[PDB]
Point group: D2
Chain length 347, copies 4
């Protein structure tokens, strides 16, 4: 019934060959779900873990991926709150000691023993994966496993970020990078949560797309020469919260100048070796807050997933084969980052 | 090394004999600590579980107790954040599904599958007990295991309660029942947390004891005929928060009338079949809040335990033998509830 | 310029005969505005005042009303941020000391010196009345004064209570009396603020109205044997918040038992001599919260009016004569108002 | 009655010559008090004003000072809650519009119409000055005006920042420049509010002073090679909060890296043209918060003065002549002030 062999996209070296091939089916432990993965999300994070850019050592031979949507096929004796057949979601955060200051506060991310899918643990580019029964998303029955896989990283994240911005219904939120993978989700979660949405992005088509998902006010950065000035103009003081999901330092630092007084600019985008250098006078005189926001926790997960379940949030995906993958890892270099890729494991 | 037999205080019937006798050493599971219990707290809750007053069915044959302080002697393969020798604490809340709305928010108490020490699971009146590795308190090395056992229920609880009152340093807090088991801990946690402490209790000696642990203002309920009036007088508006830890309905309802406007009265004491009947006009006109507060969670635990570790909180205990116990269960009826009892398991 | 005699509805002794008749125009004090009142909402508070339903005495003879919208025709020597001609709003809280701890913190309505329109200060049921300038709603030019009127007590009250319930977009809120004046506006503020809306009401066209305004789940109190269990089942475990905007004791009572674990019932409705009786055991084990909420502050007001301007809230009104007041009270006290009545002061 | 000429310290052009000399007594406006100023603290802000260190221009010629304590000798026609003879306190925020969204919410100091003592309005470095009545600290009778003076900017500022750091009793707070004017008072407000206090400073008798006032852990910046790692080790993983009350860029910088995970660095200190440069990767992965805090509001003020009255805070002062001001600025800008200087206006 459960096979011993399966297909996966492994690699035997830091920045080396990307062999799609037959590998073992991993056994699960007493705390783990055996998940038959149907679709795996794909984003730039999986390109970095491959290279060895981040300095934490990598678990070679390693199956990347951290956005797996699938089905509970087996489980360790001690697993709880899980039936066979349940739909299960594998996130960046695979596991945690569950016995430290941080793990107790739902800040399992900052756990010194953070187990990470597609990095220290074998991720979601394979037909069968193990996961911690606790951290695994509980996907409700009747949800397109393809469509949801993007929610499992970018969606949780942008939702958590949005709570962290610390807003009320009726407040303005600026999404800096609002036609991007993260931006366009941010825009929908923002709208569903009661907020007024202004947006910043550039060039061909990105404005019509923004409107078509409920954005109110667009600031074309290519045409508009004084971004701050318009943002202030448009919000009659400056945006109450701000989400930074561009890949541009300039645009982050701009954020400290268009955010409102008593307001909160939030860091999600982590451009390579970037630094946010805010003027101290401005920041004190206006009691401005600058908050970083990492992945989410079990609660954030459940919530983020309910808006999707309510149909209030959707990702414009496009599905390709799991054997295809090296091309995608290749295209991510070449520049053809463009829309949300998801991988079928049957192919 | 680890024995197969040990002593424990069991019972084979709802409200029956209380045989101190040799019983098995339980095996632990993969998620559990084997704890060699050195001292167990004792309170009225353990008297109720015995009778069958609470309507949830009881796990006969059952070893009561929910305040165990001891030592990690073994552990299941999958346990994490636990070394052998570590000091471990067994609480009312033994375990939880760790996969529901509530378990994800640190409200494991309200879990439908709440596993409870000294009720559905075998508690802390025995030399060796099993516990969930996750929920178990991590007691720091160099803490009197005798002295701490009271912290594991009344202390966590009164601390959690105090946060729930939702106060600032410099605000007044009223402890209603401030020379009692819970009251006198409440008084110390209150002081350590920055609050100004007023107190209410009655009769022989209870005022000198109150002062001797840092209480500012005492209202003798036996002498003072208009409690509300004095409390208002003394706080120049009414106490900002209030803790109810008396065993008296009258005194709870009094609380809704001496609590300040915008303030918060908190329910901890659960007198048998009692009801809090607040005047609706008063409560609206003054935006008063009435909050129930159950046991604490892993975080509350760690925090509560740090003040003890800092020596800022102490319980006037008195140690007796584990064989003694039926007498104590007997004395709790007879009326000789009087000071904090703790049980040595070597006796 | 400004006339001397005017039309008002006045009552000379408690529960007296409502007299529609020529009366003095009032003189503004130095901090006060005179306001030509054009329309005013009719609130159940006003009925409770006419009936003598609350402990506080009225100021006889009394002109009730505190949902009054009008223009500035005059003002006192000391008034700051207002021109003659502006639109102004007269609410429950006429004014306050803006100088004690409560007023400092925003809780202006809990000022022990609070002056109340339509109870201790002749309110808005007349063509000319006065209001303190610092607490008076600034209403944007080109606002329909007949339509805006009910935001000034119904709308801000319920908006503030909703913030007081500690909800999150996605959560369930139960609205007890969801087709009343406050209820109907609660439903819209709740929809707009990202919550899922359940409501309880009864009588002709109530459900019909609830559905038209954005209501998800209706429970007719006329048909449903088990209110409590129906809310439980609908919410799948209890409503995260509840807003009591009935005029009923048994409603209030039940909201203590259909609230969710870690949920919050907000008291708002003030039936005569009514009391909230909550089982202590239950409130404590579930850590349920019970909170009274009292109108809104300047900020709440600002915010509540902005939702209106955006077209997201809309009190269902019928505009009749000020001389028609007795028919409104007659028909209010029989359940039969469906939303709100406002009075044209010229008729 | 009230004199015409008085003694003041005045400067005519930026960074000019400080002139101690006979000058007009000022006339109160209708909402303003005249205050006989007896003593005033000397704050580094005043130095930054004299030097022209910030973007905002001064109001030349300027009498600095905004820690001024005095009695009411007169007031305007429109003043409400004050008698002649009362004690009054003149702070940074002279007054504000008490009528925009910011002022409505408590954030009075972020009013775009804010009037500033000792920058845009002749402050407290003279025997007579004026202040808006609604924002002026009410100081209890029998308060030592020389001693209370520094609460009026140092003390409330640091107390408000501490609330802005989101601490809990038990948590660690690092105070950067803990032996300065603000630092020394921060240390006491922190002790009183239940926090464990670490501080960083340097120069003669600084450590000595830090220990006398309740400091737990000192780090001399003069001796310690590794500031960052020393804070990390002391806190066992980072300070839960940090308060930047230095006048240094490199201090600020380091507070971004010795803050705890999910911790909060509060910006307060305003070195000229200074900037806060935080590594985005780090801020995000740890979800660190960076927050500016700007003086205090009426409520903060009230609260901060109450700590004083209870004897739990005490600025270490030395009282010299108002004509001595240049020696204070001379010695402030060399690190050498140990706590605070206040000026006797009569000398
Ligand atoms: N915080 C976390 O936990 C977390 C998790 C995963 C990924 N990420 C990060 O998310 C980031 C963004 O990913 P993405 O796929 O959304 O990017 P993307 O390339 O799909 O979109 C980026 C968008 O930013 C826009 N942009 C460029 N310059 C701009 C400017 N000056 N102002 C406004 N917009 C501008 C682009 O036009 C584009 O629409 C990455 O840096 C990645 O590291 C963060
Ligand atoms: N919320 C929870 O999670 C939780 C957990 C465990 C126990 N409890 C409860 O704690 C309660 C108290 O236990 P205890 O051992 O502290 O009681 P105790 O008998 O030791 O002390 C009660 C005190 O209340 C005083 N008292 C009596 N009438 C009073 C009045 N009118 N005003 C003020 N004080 C008055 C007594 O004089 C006494 O000092 C019990 O009802 C128990 O069920 C609650
Ligand atoms: N706390 C505050 O700040 C505040 C502010 C304004 C009004 N109020 C009070 O709120 C109450 C409601 O005011 P209104 O003017 O909206 O009243 P209203 O009479 O216009 O509407 C009351 C609604 O309650 C409903 N109701 C009756 N029995 C019920 C039951 N068993 N369950 C559920 N609903 C039931 C009615 O059908 C009706 O639609 C009054 O007591 C009023 O004084 C309080
Ligand atoms: N944000 C606000 O609301 C607010 C309010 C008042 C003052 N301030 C500002 O705060 C700053 C401090 O004010 P003050 O009057 O207390 O200053 P002060 O000069 O009296 O004290 C400054 C302290 O910083 C210390 N210091 C110097 N180098 C340091 C280093 N590398 N690390 C740590 N500490 C160091 C000094 O030794 C000194 O004790 C000023 O810039 C002032 O303008 C801000
Ligand atoms: Zn991803
Ligand atoms: Zn951990
Ligand atoms: Zn107990
Ligand atoms: Zn659970
Ligand atoms: Zn007041
Ligand atoms: Zn009303
Ligand atoms: Zn203002
Ligand atoms: Zn200052």
């Amino acid at each position: 019934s459960i096979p011993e062999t399966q297909k996966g996209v492994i690699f035997y070296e830091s920045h080396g060959k990307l062999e799609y091939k037959d590998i073992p089916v991993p056994k699960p432990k007493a705390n783990e779900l055996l998940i038959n993965v149907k679709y795996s999300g794909v984003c730039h994070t999986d390109l970095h873990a491959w290279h060895g850019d981040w300095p934490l050592p990598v678990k070679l031979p390693l199956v990347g991926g951290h956005e797996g949507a699938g089905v509970v096929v087996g489980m360790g004796e001690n697993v709880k709150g899980w039936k066979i057949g349940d739909y299960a979601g594998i996130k960046w955060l695979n596991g945690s000691c569950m016995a430290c200051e941080y793990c107790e506060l739902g800040n399992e991310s900052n756990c010194p023993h953070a187990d990470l899918s597609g990095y220290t643990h074998d991720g979601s580019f394979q037909q069968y994966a193990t996961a911690d029964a606790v951290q695994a998303a509980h996907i409700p029955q009747g949800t397109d496993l393809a469509q949801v896989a993007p929610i499992l990283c970018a969606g949780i994240t942008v939702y958590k970020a949005l709570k962290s911005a610390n807003l009320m219904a009726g407040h303005w939120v600026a999404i800096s990078g609002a036609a991007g993978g993260l931006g366009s989700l941010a825009v929908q979660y923002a709208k569903a949560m009661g907020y007024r949405v202004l947006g910043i992005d550039g060039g061909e088509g990105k404005e019509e797309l923004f409107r078509s998902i409920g954005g109110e006010v667009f600031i074309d950065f290519t045409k508009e020469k004084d971004i701050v000035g318009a943002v202030l103009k448009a919000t009659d003081g400056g945006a109450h919260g701000v989400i930074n999901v561009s890949v541009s330092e300039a645009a982050i630092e701009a954020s400290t100048r268009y955010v409102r007084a008593n307001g909160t600019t939030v860091l999600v985008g982590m451009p390579a070796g970037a630094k946010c250098c805010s003027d101290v006078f401005n920041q004190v005189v206006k009691s401005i807050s600058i908050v970083g926001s990492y992945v989410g926790n079990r609660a954030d997960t459940r919530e983020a997933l309910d808006f999707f379940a309510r149909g209030l949030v959707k990702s414009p995906i496009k599905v390709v084969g799991l054997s295809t993958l090296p091309e995608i890892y290749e295209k991510m270099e070449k520049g053809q980052i463009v829309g949300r890729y998801v991988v079928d494991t049957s192919k």
